[PDB]
Subunit: 388 residues, 2 copies
């Protein structure tokens, strides 16, 4: 019997994969670790469902894992959420299960451990400070200069990232409730650096047995990005940087998302890496360009199966644009017909409909050259509107 | 300001080291994590003493470490106890502190992860089963043959180690109270192996920057050990086995204690390894033979100082014997003079005297050959007696 431990939230992709897998294979046993609000998503098909409110708590996870092992051993641990990456790596190493280990997972979660390893190896990285207190921000803000970026060392700073321009900006974020979000609680590690933004790139990879099965290098542009060519001058430089990070972090199997920055000097520094599949349109941008399924392939790797990576690339420069979505009662936005009129657009993906209480949509395109992209951005930027 | 986090119990060596270091250096800041019963050992000289009930609990240690960092950053973490090895490695990796990492420390604590890593590399290891329940013992006991050894996978399982000869031996350990120790709770991962009487050796090493500064290979036997010669036939293979284990576990800095078993076939298999200095007489046995201090040197390594381990070897085969100690009212034992009469003996170290409420003593010798040892061993049992 193949016992698989799945640590997922509400992401439908791994749910559909293992649900369809159980239907076609009697040997498949699915154990699920998820939140209480996600339990009905697994209750009717999964063999075992364990409810956990906080997956980050390694102590509770170890205790739970022991109880799970009593039912039977685990052959594979599948971590499809960001909060489960470090936990997944911890469980694999501690209980002798094949897959990405703790330290490898630690480098793709803890920015402090990530930046520390890269600086020791020779991989160029932006400076940083360890921040244990919001009261240490003025001290940190003066050491490298204002303004600053303050974000949690673990995970990504979704609603926990703040830009502080001055001391009196901080002291009023300190005074307002809650101007510093959950950071004021001082229960989590933080990292801080001066807001340095230039040209940004991102490299999305798929590893197996230490080798790259697939790699796509794109460039960020309302936001968006577009996939670069292998013949692009910067492609070779980013790819070798990907090689360096992979060797340093000992990457062997799984997905990867590495963000690269280019200084005005032209130096390439490493921003952040993750064991995730590219968020938003990135996953779907790749699927249109190469006609391969990142989810289907990576999940096959996670359970030690042969991934069906048959790369059939379409010609031209493929990318996507995302449209911001403000909270409230959606009254009217740009019609689908108005987008599809624009030449080069492949698909328009709405996330909301007319008359909803709340990206709003994603525009996937296919152009022949990169010059058009900055032109297309202007037209999209032009005809987009959201009234609520 | 050199901030050092010391995680120690009641071992006097690191206490004496950092207490004298603080007296001769005011820049030295000592933070201590220990149990409440060990607090007076640090309260009068250490800068900060933090009381902790369970050092193994990684979640509460992470939370505590954050509070410690608020006082100030940490330059070095010194873990001198067995329960602190994995915790220390976790804290170093998670908080970007130089020293032995999580996985490295995990391989010298978790026998399951140890045995798994060694098997993947090709390094010979005795067979084993994962035991999640004491009720799973009869299944494991029938699978490998009786008798078997059951001990916790984490730590060294002091007084949580049991020899089980039959199924009904298990059922009487199960029915009695205390007979199966703390294992009956089924709250910790356990390991199982056939109890096979074999020759065992132990290799004590000291690492720095991935290189061996010192290495000593000895042989186990009333207990004892004696240091082997570099020209000993088995010395080169055990040393080469040490290289393999170190490479697999990526050992860079700190002490090491590797136990090796030799089968009737003459095969050398890896028993156990630990990030520790050899227990009992081992440290002083080496100290008499090589005139080097494992404690003084390793502690210097832990705080990134140069140890000048200048080996001045005395001639002859040096070793020690330890004498068992029964609980009760000690009335009379073998006098020191009777020991000192025996030619070849270097020092007699008693731990108890006549009229105490409770190893009993350690006899360090210096002989020319291994044959002498078994002559001396015969002599010790002969002239040994303990009445209470």
């Amino acid at each position: 019997m193949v016992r698989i431990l799945l640590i997922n939230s509400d992401k439908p992709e791994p749910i559909q994969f293992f649900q369809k897998d159980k239907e076609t294979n009697d040997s498949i046993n699915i154990s699920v670790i998820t939140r209480s609000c996600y339990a009905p998503l697994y209750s009717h098909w999964a063999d075992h469902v364990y409810i956990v409110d906080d997956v980050t708590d390694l102590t509770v996870m170890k205790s739970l894992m022991l109880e799970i092992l009593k039912v039977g051993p685990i052959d594979h641990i599948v971590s499809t959420t960001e909060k489960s990456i470090l936990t997944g790596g911890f469980l694999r190493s501690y209980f002798g299960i094949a897959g990405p280990g703790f330290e490898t997972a630690l480098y793709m979660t803890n920015k402090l451990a990530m930046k520390t390893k890269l600086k020791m190896e020779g991989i160029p990285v932006a400076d940083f400070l360890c921040v244990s207190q919001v009261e240490d921000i003025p001290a940190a803000g003066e050491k490298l200069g204002w303004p600053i970026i303050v974000k949690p060392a673990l995970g990504s700073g979704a609603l926990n990232t703040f830009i502080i321009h001055s001391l009196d900006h901080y002291e009023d974020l300190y005074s307002t409730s809650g101007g510093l979000g959950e950071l004021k609680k001082n229960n989590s590690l933080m990292i801080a650096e001066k807001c340095i933004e230039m040209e940004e790139f991102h490299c999305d990879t798929l590893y197996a047995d230490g080798e790259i099965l697939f790699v796509s290098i794109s460039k960020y542009t309302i936001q968006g990005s577009f996939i670069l060519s292998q013949n692009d001058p910067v492609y070779a430089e980013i790819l070798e940087l990907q090689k360096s990070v992979a060797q340093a972090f000992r990457i062997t199997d799984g997905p990867g998302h590495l963000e690269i920055y280019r200084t005005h000097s032209g130096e390439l520094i490493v921003g952040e890496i993750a064991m995730r599949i590219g968020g938003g349109g990135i996953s779907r941008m790749i699927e249109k360009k190469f006609n391969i399924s990142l989810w289907e392939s990576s999940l096959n790797i996670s359970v030690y199966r042969d991934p069906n990576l048959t790369v059939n690339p379409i010609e031209g420069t493929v990318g996507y644009f995302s449209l911001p979505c403000r909270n409230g009662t959606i009254k009217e936005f740009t019609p689908i017909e108005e987008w599809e009129k624009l030449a080069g657009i492949l698909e328009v993906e709405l996330l909301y409909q007319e008359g909803d209480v709340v990206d709003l949509a994603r525009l996937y395109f296919c152009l022949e050259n990169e010059n058009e992209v900055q032109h297309l951005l202007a037209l999209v930027k032009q005809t987009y509107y959201l009234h609520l």
